[PDB]
Design a protein around this ligand. Structure first.
Ligand SMILES: Nc1ncnc2c1ncn2[C@@H]1O[C@H](COP(=O)(O)OP(=O)(O)OP(O)(O)=S)[C@@H](O)[C@H]1O
Ligand SMILES: [Mg+2]
Lengths: 333, 56
DNA sequence: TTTTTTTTTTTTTTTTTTTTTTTTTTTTTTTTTTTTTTTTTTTTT
DNA sequence: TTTTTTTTTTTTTTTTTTTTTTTTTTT
């Protein structure tokens, strides 16, 4: 009896809100399809597993940070390359003024369709991000270094002049404005960030990031990337051994890690991962420094085993399919 | 709000004194902006109450 | 020493201002969290 | 005895509101 009057009161209120603010202003969460998490590839299969939901989420903010020459720019160009191959439009805001387009082409980016901007101030850079979000016509935006997003007052002023908390205040305003617009447009925003040291503390980590605290709250994924070794062909150093750690995750469990090789000129070594996942899931047999697939010996050492998976695409297609079925917790075929 | 307070002070002051009634207002604090001199702390609801109060 | 004892509107404009220079009169908080780091292996000469 | 006639003119102010944000090693 009392339930009936409350159902009517609710229906009326829901009606009034939808009138005043538009059709999709308030819905039941179960019947709202805009609220579903869609993901795109990172270029690394081991990273797609570590993220849990199969890749980076569309309509959200992501942060990648680490020390110098750790592979941050290379990793974001592999994301752009994978998205372009699925017919998506991509932008690159280069605030560091250090992007090489010949290297971008070698990693597999379509240079001719990549929108690029080299802005003068931090405010100009974040106003272009807001404009491209609202447009609805861009899928992936990369902002290379938060650290190089200098406010207007600091560029007009002279070296030595104190502008304490000015960059932090700009980033807090940018997050507030960008978050709503990115979600409506279904646009992925990636921020690259540098490491700085915090002075006069012994408890906890002395490592921090530039640009204040807002970005830590608003980011749906935060990745810590680090160079953990060299890749050699006898003497010649040909690439880097890399570890990515998922330090924050809001679409799946955090604190999982990924290990892969970045080869200079080629980018991320896909077949290198496929061996390591094949060994892990008992689809490839290992006898010391010898690799074997279904009895027959594929090679000796990881490099020869990887070179075997290159010139046998049938076995490479087969193993990829089974690893994808098994380990990916939410496959999207 | 200030104009409502200014009007209530005029109406009340005479009636409280005639009845011999004590009226206590609680107020909250709020920050002023564009203030280099003195305290940036203000109170809420205008200026009338600072004039009409016997004790603050 | 009077009585009326019932009324109407019926649609408007202004024709562009100054101010003529601000105050203040010295406050507070009232005691936090950290939550655990990396490095990736140098050079001598 | 005998019978009405016709509008006029403006006055005067009242009251505040509310904070934002870190930055960087030294032998
Ligand atoms: N044009 C290039 N040709 C060959 N190797 C390159 C080139 N650019 C970068 N690399 C290498 O790829 C590895 C990762 O480089 P990046 O992706 O630039 O890492 P990063 O963290 O962006 O470095 P920064 O911006 O300089 S702090 C490094 O060992 C580089 O030397
Ligand atoms: Mg870079």
């Amino acid at each position: 009896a009392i339930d009936e009057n409350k159902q009517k009161a609710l229906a009326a209120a829901l009606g009034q809100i939808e009138k005043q603010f538009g059709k999709g202003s308030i819905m039941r969460l179960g019947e709202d399809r805009s609220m579903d998490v869609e993901t795109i590839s990172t270029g690394s299969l081991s990273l797609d597993i570590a993220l849990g939901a199969g890749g980076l989420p569309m309509g959200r903010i992501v942060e990648i940070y680490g020390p110098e020459s750790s592979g941050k720019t290379t990793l974001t160009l592999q994301v752009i390359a994978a998205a372009q191959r699925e017919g998506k439009t991509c932008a690159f805001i280069d605030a560091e003024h250090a992007l090489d387009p010949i290297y971008a082409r070698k990693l597999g980016v379509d240079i001719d369709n990549l929108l690029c901007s080299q802005p003068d101030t931090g405010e100009q850079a974040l106003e272009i991000c807001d404009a491209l979000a609202r447009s609805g016509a861009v899928d992936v935006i990369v902002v290379d270094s938060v650290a190089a997003l200098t406010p207007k007052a600091e560029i007009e002023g002279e070296i030595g002049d104190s502008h304490m908390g000015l960059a932090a205040r700009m980033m807090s305003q940018a997050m507030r404005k960008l978050a709503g617009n990115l979600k409506q447009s279904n646009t992925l925003l990636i921020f690259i960030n540098q490491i700085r040291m915090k002075i006069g503390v012994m408890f906890g980590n002395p490592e921090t990031t530039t640009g204040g605290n807002a970005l830590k709250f608003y980011a749906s994924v935060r990745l810590d990337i680090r160079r953990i070794g060299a890749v050699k062909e006898g003497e010649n150093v040909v690439g880097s051994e890399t570890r990515v750690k998922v330090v924050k995750n809001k679409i799946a469990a955090p604190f999982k890690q990924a290990e892969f090789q970045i080869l200079y000129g080629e980018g991320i070594n896909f077949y290198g991962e496929l061996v390591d996942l094949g060994v892990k899931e008992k689809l490839i047999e290992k006898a010391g420094a010898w690799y074997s697939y279904k009895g027959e010996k594929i090679g000796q050492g990881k490099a020869n085993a990887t070179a075997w998976l290159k010139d046998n695409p049938e076995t490479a297609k087969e193993i990829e399919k089974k690893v994808r079925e098994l380990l990916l917790s939410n496959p999207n075929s």
